[PDB]
Symmetry: D2
């Protein structure tokens, strides 16, 4: 029964053609949904009750579009998101952190516009986790956003939005200095011929997967759901194809901001992403990712590829990793394991930010530190196992891979352990 | 010999990649498509696309197959549409090197347990009006195809039957349906209601894969450019959907309401044309050819043996085209199954085979109207020269190019066995 | 070039030109052949073990000491000829030469003792002489038995039963010497600890031109099973009378290593020849060169693809450790083992990194020579009060011995494989450590 | 039938990995194809008897080597005369005549820097006696090959020059030597002294790989069956060495002392024949063909384009043979570089080309002696029938088999452009 679920017959295929032939509509997805859902917050989804339903449906990141709306409006939206998120903080084994992202208005006619400087300052003051920098054309644009965040905004992730021809041409220099990329298809589809956008999407997803950096596919994914309760055949196909391409996050804009079915749009993306993740051809994908990743003498990098390889060998349910900054979880995520990466952290910001990485399920550990560090590490691993059993990831008898370091502080990951559940 | 500029067009840097990941990374928005569009466009004929002037613009935009939906309209309405399509198509027959054959397909209303009474009448209509293809609605098992084949009566055994998979039973019995059908249509509209909407992409990918494996045409249909019914430009998801159906391996892409009732029927056809050209260049031929080769079984049929030899030779020299002489279309279909980058120019005297080969990706049919020569070898050579003259006129060929020429050793269908390398002079 | 640029900056261009590293980066096997360089020097220690047959030419304690220094790992006693008294004297001489180096771990090289049976000859089952010879082996504490003319699985069960209750730890290597053995190979392999491709008898039981097919099929199936495979007979035959081998002989040795043989053997070359030490040195030299010419990119992928899924943590940790060793060009994988099993599971994935096996079992230290790439270290210190400290002392012993023997350098990365509790069968931890 | 797919290692050929391929190798899977690696036998006291030479030709000798390291010009002229007499004794039955090449192995430069005076005399002797191949000893750089070419003068323009790599400089300057040579000989005897004995296998594997990549013949020589000089059976290392040279990709394998001066010259030739047949079936064509196509660059030469198409078509139908018409041997050489499993039967009128194509693996030369037909197309068809008749007589072909035929569109060398699929009647 196990080998007939989650497209396991199609996963055993020796060719991609044989893999397509073996895809089964009756082979049910078992794994948790890995691709994160970014929902834009607007009038259709601003109430605390609305937001609680959206978190339950699968929203991981809340986007604030600073193109329209006042600072007062956006501060109220942030307060509402935080209130809906913290309403679930009473049960720590099931708490789902939700990141807050600020989408800048952009340079328009102008370098960094004065409104952008004010909006970036607002973001730092309100503790946003991510910034979607609009119309990034070169590496110096990213540096300008980083300087506008100042010394207080060091921890904020900068995701560069590629929306025009120059951004696509200077992609490699932009990616080198950004934390991730957003394929902003709306403006891109106007700046370049509409029929070429899929080429830019596929090239950018490929290069981000190669770099190990998050990539977001955005705009008009379920557009018809703004007025209709069901998406078109092209829309469900578009979402599935962005996941198959290798997108870390999928986004909803007007569908959640102004539409009549914001919760239904989130549920629809959740349903499609789960099916698409099972249809991934891991045999070729893992080989190509493994081959392309450079040789490294960084123990975190070395332990990560050992852990992903071991997870494939035993069909591990999860890889539990201890992380301070999210880096150890991100290095596991780049090799695209089929096993869920349960990241246990004390940093609330790192817990929200790891939603950018496909397959990372953040767990915020709130307990106070133990006297003996080894015991504190062991307690955090047990917390990961308990939350895993509670959320359905783990069952007794399952194998898990545990990734830890030899000393406290970030950057010392070097241990991988094979563990039997209970 | 070819120059540095040549190797920067039609995604040639991405084609040289050693991995699919490297291939994705090398895709360039500035690498212009050079090859002609190989995925055929099926347009549904309706109120928005009925006039002879409108049909002439649609043929110029890229329509290869005209669909008549027998769920709507009447026998009289649909007979007038057929007459209008034929009139617009024949308006270009005066320039024989640039004439474009256009197939006519009848989409049945559907089933009741057996073949409905209306379907029997609509199939009789189809045979009487000389349709080339039938899209059989709601095919659930092989016996459904046999019923359609029997209803095509005495005079219509040459009509192609494309089975529409629109429900769970069709998907489950797919292999038996494909065995007895000429091709498949992934009818996403009904399928998306009969099975969960989020599973349709799995059925589409499985079905395209199995059709590519079988060497039979596969059509992706419904809501491809849906928003273009009222808006002059499609959504980002729509252009992506069309590109992905071509990348998946679809032989044909379809327009329904976009051409039947929409405000932009010509623009919808142009949009599908533009996307398909870009998507065809993005195909990773290195892996695709090897996998098609590896999966295909051994053959002792000289037509199949010559076909794989010709495709292999076309890849070796970056041949502009493979010119094939075909009576029934079979030799062109066997070349098409290996997915060459080179255009398959099929020269035929059969007007029905010329229309029907639009079902096969990369087959450009040419209807030869000249009278036969006394010596067969001369007649064969004249038809090959006609393929070269048409290829030069339409832009496929230039002097100095290499083409592969596929012929047989004797007249009549079924004797293809020769492959020749020719330099265009 | 991008997948090695940073490591090229760190380790230098000289590092990437040694041990056929340009040929290892090749995308095709054809490109790999084209890139093989006679100026690319082997760096890693020799991983294919050398089995030398003991005889009049290699019996003296002084001769045996020179052979151990030249690279002999396993000493074979051919029971086809010679009395029990003769073979007991050879065992005594081998043990005396081996123990002459037991002062320190950087000199000590544990050498296994293997008994090659006479065989069934005319008879159907286990001959009376074989029963007597097998009981002699148990009484003298041999580590391996090369069972001659194994024709079916029941033959290996007869050898196991003849070893009795005390010989339960002895490894049984079945010799395939005829057509029936080749046909029933799968059933024989399933019940044996390993296989020997006994080409001498095989070459007259089947057509001489077919022996290479049997050798390649058998090595392939043993590599697939993760069981040791020995290539034997006439490898350096001309060296019995000549100081240098023929061009076909050096090629044969290299090809057996490239095929995937865990051990290569010398028979008449060491037992009766005029150059026993030179024959051992020649096999050593060829095996190092051949090991570097292996195309690990394809071999590792195929070994993974073919290996079934496992829920045994020892197996899961083993593949994780080998994968991590390839990622950082690790000098070694240090593994703690009681029976040798953890070292064997690392060895089946054919790492380029040396597997340094730290063990307290002298028998396991001798027996791991059957596995390609396993370098046994016998730990002689008495146990610590705290097990975690005892484990850490054994790991440090491995590092110190690796540094002192040339296996490791400061700045190198090593992969350390251990278990969560004492006793055999609990391996589950992989650690990435930087040598300081 | 089932029986067919159990012979010539066909189960091991279907394997998806090289490891699975090794596991599937069967000692009971009998070779069916003819032996494709040529056997070079050195002539001497053991093999000068015209009766002994006839037995060696029957055993499988394709090329006869004269070692100019020793022996007078009188001695070597007698050896040539005896080889020609034994070869021409079979000319009376043209469907079974086996051409045998004569190769001159030079003494070398020794202490000197350039072409020695003795080498000039021996090269002039070779041209005067009509040798087909020269094995130039101790080639250290491209200029050494040019010196041998100049010493052959204008009359020796047709002689093939195979450079022997016997030292470190030759291995280091390999690419420049290969560029100007017709082929390479891995001269392991001297090479094993000039470089450490344990490194010779690396030089052999690198050189065979680069020659296979270039499409140029490579010979593996020295001590292959050394023990057979005095013993009737080889050692286990010897049979393994021969098999491994064929598996590596060697076009020719050589016997030196074993045939020139030993006690079992015919048995040594038979032994090489037996091993080469088994080893050729054990080649993993699935990987080899893919790597050879991937490594070969795009070509606009119709001979090269037709060659890869023909090899691909031969694999598709399990063709018994590829019959090719050749004047210089070039068309057969281009087929041979892709390493087909099908025998390349080369039909030629040039006696020199017939002898020289023995350097290419899988090429079986047929010397066509009949006078030309009035119509060229008929003359071409008679030559194709001659290949079929020789093939049937020699065991390569049976009625019902498929054969690929490679020809050109006009007489003269360099016009190969046609590939045809033919059913044997
Ligand atoms: O999921 S993967 O393993 C993954 C691996 C390989 C490929 C093949 C890419 N081709 C293609 C692209 C499509 O979009 C599509 O639907 C169908 C086909 C196709 C169909 C065939 O029937 C066929 O035989 C070959 C192709 S194709 O090679 O042209 C796709 C995906 C992964 C995905 C993304 C990566 O970055 C990666 O490294 C690997
Ligand atoms: O060590 S022997 O068994 C022994 C020693 C040498 C040889 C030489 C001939 N070969 C061969 C031929 C056979 O028909 C056969 O049956 C076995 C073998 C064989 C076996 C081997 O184990 C081996 O090392 C070499 C060969 S071989 O292929 O060369 C045979 C046999 C012994 C040694 C001393 C003797 O008095 C005696 O009669 C036999
Ligand atoms: O092929 S035979 O004619 C045949 C068999 C045995 C011999 C013995 C000669 N040698 C020898 C003698 C020994 O006392 C010994 O301990 C080892 C070796 C030996 C071992 C080797 O591994 C090796 O390769 C060569 C030799 S050796 O040549 O030096 C001669 C000839 C036949 C075949 C089968 C037999 O079983 C048999 O007894 C004789
Ligand atoms: O055939 S010979 O060239 C000639 C014949 C035999 C030997 C010894 C056997 N070996 C060998 C065999 C050959 O067939 C060959 O070509 C080269 C080599 C070779 C060359 C070396 O220079 C070397 O040092 C060692 C070897 S080898 O030991 O591997 C040397 C030489 C000739 C034979 C007889 C003569 O009278 C004569 O002048 C030359
Ligand atoms: O070292 S390997 O990675 C490894 C070893 C060999 C192969 C062979 C692929 N072939 C091939 C392809 C080429 O382009 C070429 O130029 C030569 C040959 C070749 C050479 C030979 O010497 C030969 O014996 C056979 C062939 S082949 O035709 O089969 C692949 C891979 C390993 C060795 C053993 C294994 O079990 C395994 O999985 C992999
Ligand atoms: O000068 S030597 O090193 C010295 C040693 C050997 C040799 C060649 C002797 N052979 C031989 C003799 C021939 O005329 C001939 O046409 C071919 C071959 C030959 C070829 C081969 O291909 C092969 O592999 C072996 C031989 S062979 O050994 O039978 C020359 C010279 C020396 C060695 C030992 C002595 O005791 C001595 O007096 C001289
Ligand atoms: O992924 P990061 O940010 O490098 O953090 C991983 C770190 O987490 C740990 O496992 C636990 O460290 P702390 O106890 O200080 O949180 C370290 O050993 C390791 O270095
Ligand atoms: O593709 P099909 O229908 O089998 O037809 C291919 C046939 O066309 C030809 O090339 C030309 O034949 P005709 O001259 O009769 O049209 C035949 O030699 C070959 O058999
Ligand atoms: O390879 P084996 O025989 O399973 O032994 C590995 C064992 O060695 C250890 O690392 C150390 O155990 P000991 O204290 O018994 O020596 C165990 O944790 C592990 O189970
Ligand atoms: O292999 P080569 O030397 O190029 O010769 C091939 C030539 O042989 C032919 O098939 C027959 O030519 P001839 O009749 O002149 O011998 C030519 O058409 C072709 O050009
Ligand atoms: O800003 C965006 O997200 C866009 O344009 O798609
Ligand atoms: O009938 C159709 O085309 C459908 O259902 O998609
Ligand atoms: O006993 C052996 O090793 C043989 O016969 O090969
Ligand atoms: O000349 C040769 O052939 C040699 O020296 O090996
Ligand atoms: K319909
Ligand atoms: K010579």
């Amino acid at each position: 029964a196990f080998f007939q679920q989650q497209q396991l017959p199609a996963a055993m295929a020796d060719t991609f053609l044989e893999h397509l032939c073996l895809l089964d509509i009756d082979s049910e997805p078992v794994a948790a949904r890995s691709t994160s859902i970014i929902a834009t917050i607007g009038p259709a989804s601003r109430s605390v009750e609305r937001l609680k339903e959206m978190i339950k449906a699968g929203m991981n990141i809340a986007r604030l579009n600073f193109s329209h709306g006042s600072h007062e409006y956006h501060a109220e939206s942030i307060a509402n998101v935080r209130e809906a998120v913290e309403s679930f903080a009473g049960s720590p084994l099931s708490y789902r952190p939700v990141a807050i992202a600020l989408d800048t208005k952009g340079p328009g006619s102008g370098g960094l516009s004065e409104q952008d400087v004010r909006d970036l300052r607002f973001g730092v003051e309100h503790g946003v986790d991510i910034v979607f920098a609009s119309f990034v054309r070169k590496a110096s644009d990213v540096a300008a956003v980083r300087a506008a965040l100042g010394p207080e905004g060091h921890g904020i992730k900068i995701i560069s939005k590629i929306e025009n021809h120059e951004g696509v041409k200077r992609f490699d220099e932009i990616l080198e200095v950004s934390d991730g990329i957003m394929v902003a298809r709306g403006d891109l589809g106007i700046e370049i011929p509409a029929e070429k956008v899929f080429l830019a999407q596929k090239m950018m997803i490929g290069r981000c997967n190669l770099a190990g950096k998050p990539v977001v596919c955005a705009t008009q994914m379920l557009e018809s759901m703004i007025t209709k309760p069901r998406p078109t055949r092209a829309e469900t196909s578009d979402v599935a194809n962005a996941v198959l391409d290798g997108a870390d996050c999928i986004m909803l804009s007007g569908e959640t901001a102004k539409g009549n079915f914001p919760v239904e749009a989130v549920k629809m993306q959740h349903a499609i992403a789960r099916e698409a993740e099972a249809a991934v051809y891991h045999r070729q994908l893992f080989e190509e990712l493994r081959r392309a990743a450079p040789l490294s003498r960084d123990p975190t990098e070395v332990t990560a590829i050992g852990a992903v390889e071991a997870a494939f060998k035993c069909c591990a349910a999860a890889i539990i990793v201890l992380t301070t900054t999210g880096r150890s979880a991100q290095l596991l995520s780049r090799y695209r394991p089929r096993a869920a990466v349960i990241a246990v952290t004390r940093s609330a910001q790192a817990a929200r930010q790891v939603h950018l990485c496909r397959g990372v399920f953040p767990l915020l550990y709130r307990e106070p530190p133990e006297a003996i560090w080894a015991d504190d590490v062991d307690r955090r691993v047990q917390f990961g196992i308990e939350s895993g059993k509670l959320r359905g990831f783990l069952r007794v008898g399952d194998l898990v891979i545990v990734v830890t370091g030899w000393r406290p502080g970030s950057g010392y990951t070097n241990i991988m352990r094979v563990l039997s559940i209970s």
